[PDB]
Amino acid sequence: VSRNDIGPSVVLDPTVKCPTLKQFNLSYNQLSFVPENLTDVVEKLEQLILEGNKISGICSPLRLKELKILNLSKNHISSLSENFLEACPKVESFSARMNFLAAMPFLPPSMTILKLSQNKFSCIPEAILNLPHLRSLDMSSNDIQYLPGPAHWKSLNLRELLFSHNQISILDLSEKAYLWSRVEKLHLSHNKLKEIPPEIGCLENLTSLDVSYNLELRSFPNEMGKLSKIWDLPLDELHLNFDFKHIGCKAKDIIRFLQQRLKKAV
């Protein structure tokens, strides 16, 4: 039941017990709360999608022991309660885009995907750097000042990082850059990046690297030429010192060119 004008609050009657409902889509309605009595009634819920509604701010903790995908994107939330997700130990995906979120509370350690974009984070929360298995992460269009180096992140299966449109100055990869060896997408477009670190060649499994629209960026380091698996390397509005006007725009050509300059440069 989505895109209807349901509202302003859904109250499921406690006398009804529906243990077979393994999905619930209440998106794009005019809800102003989470659906109440959702734990006693919809016992085994998998995907609770409440996108697009105008939800003010959560106060009652979900208790769905079997939740797997939550989705509260495009809402009016500004702060999530400090124990609102503690009683759902199976959460993997959690989307909270386009809110006014500023702090992230305690999360279950099973969370694999976590897409918090466009939603006012001044800095990466400390509660998300300790996620044991955090495959994907998207925090685009926030105001992020400094992302920590690969030593601070607890995860080991980091496979996609999105941080475009942030106020990031210095990408740090000095200490233990091999921990990110599984990263398959790293976006840093529309930032204040100054220089790609020479240790970037250690991320031997990159398939895309978007450092476009970085005016302060000047030249690519030679060591980048070892990222043999890269197939996308956008260069739009990138005033490069090193001339590749003879090479063109093919990403594989850029990588091979840098790879030859590794051996010798005259």
From Swiss-Prot:
Q: What is the effect of changing S32C?
A: In PARK8; uncertain significance
Highest taxon of the lineage: Eukaryota
> What does the record say about tissue specificity?
Expressed in pyramidal neurons in all cortical laminae of the visual cortex, in neurons of the substantia nigra pars compacta and caudate putamen (at protein level). Expressed in neutrophils (at protein level). Expressed in the brain. Expressed throughout the adult brain, but at a lower level than in heart and liver. Also expressed in placenta, lung, skeletal muscle, kidney and pancreas. In the brain, expressed in the cerebellum, cerebral cortex, medulla, spinal cord occipital pole, frontal lobe, temporal lobe and putamen. Expression is particularly high in brain dopaminoceptive areas.
Q: How is it modified after translation?
A: Autophosphorylated at Ser-228; autophosphorylation is stimulated by RAB29.
Q: Where, subcellularly, is it found?
A: Cytoplasmic vesicle; Perikaryon; Golgi apparatus membrane; Cell projection, Axon
Q: Which residues carry this modification: Phosphoserine?
A: S228
LRR repeats sit at: 1-16, 20-41, 44-65, 66-86, 92-107, 110-132, 133-154, 157-181, 182-203, 205-227
The signal peptide here is: none
Mark the transmembrane ranges: none
Print the domain comment field: The seven-bladed WD repeat region is critical for synaptic vesicle trafficking and mediates interaction with multiple vesicle-associated presynaptic proteins. It also mediates homodimerization and regulates kinase activity. The COR domain mediates homodimerization; it also mediates homotetramerization via interaction with the protein kinase domain.
Disease per UniProt entry: Parkinson disease 8: A slowly progressive neurodegenerative disorder characterized by bradykinesia, rigidity, resting tremor, postural instability, neuronal loss in the substantia nigra, and the presence of neurofibrillary MAPT (tau)-positive and Lewy bodies in some patients.
Q: What does this protein do?
A: Serine/threonine-protein kinase which phosphorylates a broad range of proteins involved in multiple processes such as neuronal plasticity, innate immunity, autophagy, and vesicle trafficking. Is a key regulator of RAB GTPases by regulating the GTP/GDP exchange and interaction partners of RABs through phosphorylation. Phosphorylates RAB3A, RAB3B, RAB3C, RAB3D, RAB5A, RAB5B, RAB5C, RAB8A, RAB8B, RAB10, RAB12, RAB29, RAB35, and RAB43. Regulates the RAB3IP-catalyzed GDP/GTP exchange for RAB8A through the phosphorylation of 'Thr-72' on RAB8A.
The similarity comment for this entry is:
Belongs to the protein kinase superfamily. TKL Ser/Thr protein kinase family.
Q: How does it assemble?
A: Homodimer. Homotetramer; when activated by GTP-bound RAB29. Interacts with PRKN, PRDX3, and TPCN2. Interacts with VPS35. Interacts (via N-terminus) with RAB29; this interaction is direct and stimulates kinase activity. Interacts (via ROC domain) with SEC16A. Interacts with APP; interaction promotes phosphorylation of 'Thr-743' of APP. Interacts with MAPT. Interacts with RAB8A, RAB10, and RAB12. Interacts (via N-terminus) with RAB32.
Q: What is this protein called?
A: Leucine-rich repeat serine/threonine-protein kinase 2
Organism per entry: Homo sapiens (Human)
Entire protein: which part is shown?
1065 to 1330 of 2527
